Design an enzyme around this catalytic site. Structure first.
Site, PDB file in Angstrom:
ATOM      1  CG  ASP A  39      23.753-120.194  82.331  1.00  0.00           C
ATOM      2  OD1 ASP A  39      22.718-120.017  83.016  1.00  0.00           O
ATOM      3  OD2 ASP A  39      24.499-121.169  82.495  1.00  0.00           O
ATOM      4  CG  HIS A  69      23.553-124.099  84.386  1.00  0.00           C
ATOM      5  ND1 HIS A  69      23.267-122.756  84.296  1.00  0.00           N
ATOM      6  CD2 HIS A  69      22.909-124.549  85.488  1.00  0.00           C
ATOM      7  CE1 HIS A  69      22.466-122.412  85.284  1.00  0.00           C
ATOM      8  NE2 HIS A  69      22.221-123.484  86.015  1.00  0.00           N
ATOM      9  CG  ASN A 161      18.276-123.411  93.085  1.00  0.00           C
ATOM     10  OD1 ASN A 161      17.184-122.930  92.697  1.00  0.00           O
ATOM     11  ND2 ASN A 161      19.205-123.854  92.254  1.00  0.00           N
ATOM     12  CB  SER A 224      18.860-122.522  86.920  1.00  0.00           C
ATOM     13  OG  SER A 224      19.849-121.781  87.614  1.00  0.00           O
TER      14      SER A 224
END
Ligand SMILES: [Ca+2]
Length: 279
Positions: A39, A69, A161, A224
């Site tokens: 990530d 994130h 998404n 996520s």
């Protein structure tokens, strides 16, 4: 063990039912497993990680999470307040820059990195990887997920998404890994969850409280945020002895809350991750 007034998603994946706020789990809590968060990086200095988190790679000029994130996702895996697997070892791999953007080829490089590196780490109970990222279908990105999985790592990927069938997204569409959609605290599919027969499982992903950089917390939303619930859960189940890195996606599906989400389009699993501790 019980943790009262828990973020709703930890209570959910320990409940049959929505609408409660305690997280019920066996205290072993992922001890002896390893989860790679691939990530933006992990702010390992966040006391919520208590010394268990390490950056081990980057493809950019610093290994720091300068976005937030990766730190959020990692906290859901394994922070002391906000995590599923509160005694797991976390390893960061920064394949996203500090805006959230990664070229595929580097994301591939991260992924093969984990299949190798796990062999430098002490993970007696099992290895997981958590990918809260993706972009359009690529055979190559997908191949790098099958390799990582084949190498004996439980691989957990965000379905995506766009409110779209995920078979067009990568690494989600890859078959052999564990593609995760999202839900909300009222057991609705989250409005942004991709769907489609390539999903294996759903996890809490709408208003997920977790860690953020600076030492801080926030609530955000996405497949996520759902992904690291399943990664952490799999670490928790390894450690106990219920399943293995190669068997865990099947195992979680077999033990899921079955029927219970609204708006599973036809043809998408209606399965919700569950730890089977309290009942
Ligand atoms: Ca699978």
């Amino acid at each position: 063990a019980a943790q009262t007034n828990a973020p709703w998603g930890l209570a959910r994946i320990s409940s049959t039912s929505p609408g409660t706020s305690t997280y019920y789990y066996d205290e072993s809590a992922g001890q002896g497993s390893c989860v790679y968060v691939i990530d933006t990086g992990i702010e390992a200095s966040h006391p919520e990680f208590e010394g268990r988190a390490q950056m081990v790679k980057t493809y950019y000029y610093s290994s720091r999470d300068g976005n937030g994130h990766g730190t959020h996702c990692a906290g859901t895996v394994g922070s002391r307040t906000y995590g599923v697997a509160k005694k797991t070892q976390l390893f960061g791999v920064k394949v996203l820059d500090d805006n959230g953007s990664g070229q595929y080829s580097t994301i591939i490089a991260g992924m093969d990195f984990v299949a190798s590196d796990k062999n430098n780490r002490n993970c007696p109970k099992g290895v997981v990887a958590s990918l809260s990222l993706g972009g359009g279908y690529s055979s190559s990105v997908n191949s790098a997920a099958a390799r990582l999985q084949s190498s004996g790592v439980m691989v957990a990927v965000a379905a995506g998404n766009n409110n779209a069938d995920a078979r067009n997204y990568s690494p989600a569409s890859e078959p052999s890994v564990c593609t995760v959609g999202a839900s909300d605290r009222y057991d609705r599919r989250s409005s942004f969850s991709n769907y489609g027969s390539v999903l294996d499982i759903f996890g809490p992903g709408t208003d997920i409280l977790s860690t953020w950089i600076g030492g801080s917390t926030r609530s955000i939303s996405g497949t996520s945020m759902a992904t690291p619930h399943v990664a952490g859960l799999a670490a928790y189940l390894m450690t106990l002895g219920k399943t293995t890195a190669a068997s865990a996606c099947r195992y979680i599906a077999d033990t899921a809350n079955k029927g219970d989400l609204s708006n599973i389009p036809f043809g998408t699993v209606n399965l919700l991750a569950y730890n089977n501790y309290q009942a």
